[PDB]
Design an enzyme around this catalytic site. Structure first.
Site, PDB file in Angstrom:
ATOM      1  N   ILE A  18       2.265 -11.243  -0.254  1.00 17.91           N
ATOM      2  CA  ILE A  18       1.747  -9.923  -0.555  1.00 17.91           C
ATOM      3  C   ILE A  18       2.206  -8.793   0.327  1.00 17.91           C
ATOM      4  O   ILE A  18       2.348  -7.675  -0.305  1.00 17.91           O
ATOM      5  CB  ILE A  18       0.336  -9.876  -0.595  1.00 17.91           C
ATOM      6  CG1 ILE A  18      -0.467 -10.653  -1.585  1.00 17.91           C
ATOM      7  CG2 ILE A  18      -0.181  -8.364  -1.120  1.00 17.91           C
ATOM      8  CD1 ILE A  18      -1.855 -10.741  -1.848  1.00 17.91           C
TER       9      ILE A  18
ATOM     10  N   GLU B 275       3.299  -7.728   4.938  1.00 16.31           N
ATOM     11  CA  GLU B 275       3.153  -7.901   6.139  1.00 16.31           C
ATOM     12  C   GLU B 275       2.483  -6.944   7.005  1.00 16.31           C
ATOM     13  O   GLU B 275       3.213  -5.884   7.409  1.00 16.31           O
ATOM     14  CB  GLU B 275       4.430  -8.075   6.696  1.00 16.31           C
ATOM     15  CG  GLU B 275       5.260  -9.609   6.080  1.00 16.31           C
ATOM     16  CD  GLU B 275       6.465  -9.893   6.806  1.00 16.31           C
ATOM     17  OE1 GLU B 275       7.471  -9.483   6.396  1.00 16.31           O
ATOM     18  OE2 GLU B 275       6.715 -10.872   7.643  1.00 16.31           O
ATOM     19  N   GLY B 276       1.250  -6.742   7.087  1.00 16.21           N
ATOM     20  CA  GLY B 276       0.511  -5.492   7.594  1.00 16.21           C
ATOM     21  C   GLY B 276       0.985  -5.386   8.987  1.00 16.21           C
ATOM     22  O   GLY B 276       2.088  -5.630   9.475  1.00 16.21           O
TER      23      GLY B 276
ATOM     24  N   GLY C 177      -0.656  -8.943  10.704  1.00 19.37           N
ATOM     25  CA  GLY C 177      -0.106  -9.973  10.350  1.00 19.37           C
ATOM     26  C   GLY C 177       0.372 -10.028   8.997  1.00 19.37           C
ATOM     27  O   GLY C 177       0.965  -9.019   8.588  1.00 19.37           O
TER      28      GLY C 177
ATOM     29  N   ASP D  65      -7.228   2.974  10.374  1.00 18.73           N
ATOM     30  CA  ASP D  65      -5.710   3.023   9.769  1.00 18.73           C
ATOM     31  C   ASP D  65      -5.561   3.038   8.174  1.00 18.73           C
ATOM     32  O   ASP D  65      -4.982   2.159   7.414  1.00 18.73           O
ATOM     33  CB  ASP D  65      -5.004   1.689  10.171  1.00 18.73           C
ATOM     34  CG  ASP D  65      -3.656   1.491  10.050  1.00 18.73           C
ATOM     35  OD1 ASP D  65      -3.009   2.931  10.007  1.00 18.73           O
ATOM     36  OD2 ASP D  65      -2.853   0.646   9.879  1.00 18.73           O
TER      37      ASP D  65
ATOM     38  N   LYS E  48      -4.423   4.162   4.685  1.00 16.54           N
ATOM     39  CA  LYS E  48      -3.213   4.314   4.111  1.00 16.54           C
ATOM     40  C   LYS E  48      -3.100   3.818   2.803  1.00 16.54           C
ATOM     41  O   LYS E  48      -3.986   3.099   2.451  1.00 16.54           O
ATOM     42  CB  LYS E  48      -2.140   4.011   4.911  1.00 16.54           C
ATOM     43  CG  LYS E  48      -1.726   2.426   5.282  1.00 16.54           C
ATOM     44  CD  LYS E  48      -1.003   2.158   6.318  1.00 16.54           C
ATOM     45  CE  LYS E  48      -1.016   0.630   6.661  1.00 16.54           C
ATOM     46  NZ  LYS E  48       0.014   0.387   7.845  1.00 16.54           N
ATOM     47  N   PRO E  49      -2.410   4.390   1.790  1.00 18.06           N
ATOM     48  CA  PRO E  49      -2.161   3.805   0.499  1.00 18.06           C
ATOM     49  C   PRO E  49      -2.233   2.276   0.238  1.00 18.06           C
ATOM     50  O   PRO E  49      -3.103   1.844  -0.684  1.00 18.06           O
ATOM     51  CB  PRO E  49      -1.011   4.514  -0.050  1.00 18.06           C
ATOM     52  CG  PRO E  49      -1.099   5.844   0.735  1.00 18.06           C
ATOM     53  CD  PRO E  49      -1.655   5.529   1.822  1.00 18.06           C
ATOM     54  N   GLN E  50      -1.193   1.662   1.109  1.00 16.59           N
ATOM     55  CA  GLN E  50      -1.293   0.250   1.235  1.00 16.59           C
ATOM     56  C   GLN E  50      -2.536  -0.477   1.502  1.00 16.59           C
ATOM     57  O   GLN E  50      -2.555  -1.633   1.022  1.00 16.59           O
ATOM     58  CB  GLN E  50      -0.152  -0.164   2.257  1.00 16.59           C
ATOM     59  CG  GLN E  50       1.124   0.312   1.855  1.00 16.59           C
ATOM     60  CD  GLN E  50       2.247  -0.263   2.976  1.00 16.59           C
ATOM     61  OE1 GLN E  50       2.218   0.820   4.011  1.00 16.59           O
ATOM     62  NE2 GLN E  50       2.872  -1.006   2.903  1.00 16.59           N
ATOM     63  N   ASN E  51      -3.392   0.128   2.250  1.00 16.55           N
ATOM     64  CA  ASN E  51      -4.598  -0.507   2.583  1.00 16.55           C
ATOM     65  C   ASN E  51      -5.818  -0.011   1.761  1.00 16.55           C
ATOM     66  O   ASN E  51      -6.868  -0.297   1.792  1.00 16.55           O
ATOM     67  CB  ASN E  51      -5.112  -0.192   3.878  1.00 16.55           C
ATOM     68  CG  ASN E  51      -4.132  -0.710   4.994  1.00 16.55           C
ATOM     69  OD1 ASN E  51      -3.335  -1.642   4.663  1.00 16.55           O
ATOM     70  ND2 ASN E  51      -3.992  -0.200   6.237  1.00 16.55           N
TER      71      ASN E  51
HETATM   72  N1  LIG Z   1      -7.833  -8.294  -0.529  1.00 16.47           N
HETATM   73  C1  LIG Z   1      -6.395  -7.983  -0.599  1.00 16.47           C
HETATM   74  N2  LIG Z   1      -5.940  -7.958  -1.810  1.00 16.47           N
HETATM   75  C2  LIG Z   1      -4.608  -7.816  -1.824  1.00 16.47           C
HETATM   76  N3  LIG Z   1      -3.759  -7.757  -2.855  1.00 16.47           N
HETATM   77  C3  LIG Z   1      -2.997  -6.917  -3.368  1.00 16.47           C
HETATM   78  C4  LIG Z   1      -2.456  -5.916  -2.608  1.00 16.47           C
HETATM   79  C5  LIG Z   1      -1.444  -5.372  -3.011  1.00 16.47           C
HETATM   80  C6  LIG Z   1      -0.452  -5.663  -4.215  1.00 16.47           C
HETATM   81  S1  LIG Z   1       0.880  -4.734  -4.816  1.00 16.47           S
HETATM   82  N4  LIG Z   1       1.711  -4.425  -3.586  1.00 16.47           N
HETATM   83  O1  LIG Z   1       0.313  -3.457  -5.223  1.00 16.47           O
HETATM   84  O2  LIG Z   1       1.441  -5.490  -5.768  1.00 16.47           O
HETATM   85  C7  LIG Z   1      -1.039  -6.678  -5.043  1.00 16.47           C
HETATM   86  C8  LIG Z   1      -2.366  -7.628  -4.408  1.00 16.47           C
HETATM   87  S2  LIG Z   1      -4.216  -7.295  -0.294  1.00 16.47           S
HETATM   88  C9  LIG Z   1      -5.735  -7.407   0.424  1.00 16.47           C
HETATM   89  C10 LIG Z   1      -5.997  -7.156   1.664  1.00 16.47           C
HETATM   90  O3  LIG Z   1      -7.106  -7.793   1.794  1.00 16.47           O
HETATM   91  C11 LIG Z   1      -5.288  -6.497   2.494  1.00 16.47           C
HETATM   92  C12 LIG Z   1      -4.289  -5.231   2.165  1.00 16.47           C
HETATM   93  C13 LIG Z   1      -3.523  -4.748   3.235  1.00 16.47           C
HETATM   94  C14 LIG Z   1      -3.669  -5.358   4.452  1.00 16.47           C
HETATM   95  N5  LIG Z   1      -4.261  -6.400   5.013  1.00 16.47           N
HETATM   96  C15 LIG Z   1      -5.012  -7.059   3.942  1.00 16.47           C
END
Ligand SMILES: Nc1nc(Nc2ccc(S(N)(=O)=O)cc2)sc1C(=O)c1cccnc1
Length: 294
Positions: free
Chosen positions: A10, A12-13, A16, A123, A125-128
Site C-alpha cells: 500500500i 512505504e511510510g 516501515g 505526523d 499529512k494527507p497520506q495518514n
Molecule cells: N489502515 C490503513 N489502511 C490503509 N489503506 C489504504 C491507504 C491508502 C490507499 S490509496 N494510496 O489511496 O490507494 C489505499 C488503502 S493504509 C493504513 C494505515 O494504517 C497506514 C496508513 C499510512 C501509514 N501507515 C499506516
C-alpha cells in the site's frame, strides 16, 4: 507472514512498509505495517501496546501488535483510500465545502480525543488520513517518535514530507505539544480548500521561510520566546505578514478565521482541537457521502 497472505503493497511510510493483507483463517482484510533494529525497544512496545486501547470512530483501529525477529508488525483495520489520493482525484472540481467541513470536524474530534488522552500524532499529512465510502475519515500512522526519535529515512530511502511541520519543530523545540497536530491539520484544511499544499517546502529552511513569507517572520510580539529557540537565527529575513484573504481564497470568513487560529505561531495561542470544534465555522456541519472511486 504465513497467517497473512499479502494482497499488495500500500505504501512505504516513515517507519516501515504497509501492505493490504487477508487473514488466511478469519478472511479479515487488514493493513499490515512492518517496522524494522538491534532487537526492538521494550519501552516502545509498551507505548505502542498503549495505542491499542485507544478507540474512537475517527482513529484507525490498531488490532494487534506483533513483536518478532527485530521486525515489528502492526495490524490495523483496513480503509480503502487516503486523503492524498482523494485530493488528487478531486483536483479538477475540488472537494465540496460541506465534505471538507465534515472531514475537518471529524479530524478535530479524533485529535480532541487523542489529546485528552495524552496522545500526540506528530505526523499528520494527507497520506495518514484514511477515508471510507461512509463519509468517515480517520487518523492513522501516529508517528511514534515519542518513542523512536525523528525518522531520518526508511528502508528504501524516502524523502520525508515537511509540508505539515509546525514552526516550533522546525525551530528546534525538543518538546512537542498537542499544538503541533493542530498546525498540521490547519495546513491540510487549507490544502483541501485551495487544491494546493499551503507550505510545500523542499528542505527544512525552505519550509520555514515559506511559512515566514506567508505568515510574516515571527518576533517576540507575536511569539514570546521565539528569538531564544534553538535554531532561531537573528539573521532570518524579516518578511511582512500576507493578507489572509490571499492565502485560502475563496474560503469564507468563518473558515479563514478558524484557519488563522489553527496557524498562530505561538503554540500557546494556537487553538485547541476542543475549542476548534466549537468555532462558528461548524455551525452548519453535516456528514456528506464522498464520491469514491475504488
Ligand atoms: N489502515 C490503513 N489502511 C490503509 N489503506 C489504504 C491507504 C491508502 C490507499 S490509496 N494510496 O489511496 O490507494 C489505499 C488503502 S493504509 C493504513 C494505515 O494504517 C497506514 C496508513 C499510512 C501509514 N501507515 C499506516
Amino acid at each position: 507472514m504465513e497467517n497473512f497472505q499479502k494482497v499488495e503493497k500500500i505504501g512505504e511510510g516513515t517507519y516501515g512498509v504497509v501492505y493490504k493483507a487477508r487473514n488466511k483463517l478469519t478472511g479479515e482484510v487488514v493493513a499490515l505495517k512492518k517496522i524494522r533494529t538491534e532487537g526492538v525497544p521494550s519501552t516502545a512496545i509498551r507505548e505502542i501496546s498503549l495505542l491499542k486501547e485507544l478507540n474512537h470512530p475517527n482513529i484507525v483501529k490498531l488490532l494487534d501488535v506483533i513483536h518478532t525477529e527485530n521486525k515489528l508488525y502492526l495490524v490495523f483495520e483496513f480503509l480503502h483510500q487516503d486523503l492524498k489520493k482523494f485530493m488528487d482525484a478531486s483536483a479538477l472540481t475540488g472537494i465540496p465545502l460541506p465534505l471538507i467541513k465534515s472531514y475537518l470536524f471529524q479530524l478535530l474530534q479524533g485529535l480532541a480525543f487523542c489529546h485528552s488522552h495524552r496522545v500526540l500524532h506528530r505526523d499528520l499529512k494527507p497520506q495518514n488520513l484514511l477515508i471510507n465510502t461512509e463519509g468517515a475519515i480517520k487518523l492513522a500512522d501516529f508517528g511514534l517518535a515519542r518513542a523512536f526519535g525523528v525518522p531520518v529515512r526508511t528502508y528504501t530511502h524516502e524523502v520525508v514530507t515537511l509540508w505539515y511541520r509546525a514552526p516550533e519543530i522546525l525551530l528546534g523545540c525538543k518538546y512537542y505539544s498537542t499544538a503541533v497536530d493542530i498546525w498540521s491539520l490547519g495546513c491540510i484544511f487549507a490544502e483541501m480548500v485551495t487544491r494546493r499544499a499551503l507550505f510545500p517546502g523542499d528542505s527544512e529552511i525552505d519550509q520555514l521561510f515559506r511559512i515566514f513569507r506567508t505568515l510574516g517572520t515571527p518576533d517576540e510580539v507575536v511569539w514570546p520566546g521565539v528569538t531564544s529557540m534553538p535554531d532561531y537565527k537573528p539573521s532570518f529575513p524579516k518578511w511582512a505578514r500576507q493578507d489572509f484573504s490571499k492565502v485560502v481564497p475563496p474560503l469564507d470568513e468563518d473558515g479563514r478565521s478558524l484557519l488563522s487560529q489553527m496557524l498562530h505561531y505561538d503554540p500557546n495561542k494556537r487553538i485547541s482541537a476542543k475549542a476548534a470544534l466549537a468555532h462558528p465555522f461548524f455551525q452548519d456541519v453535516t456528514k456528506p457521502v464522498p464520491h469514491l472511486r475504488l
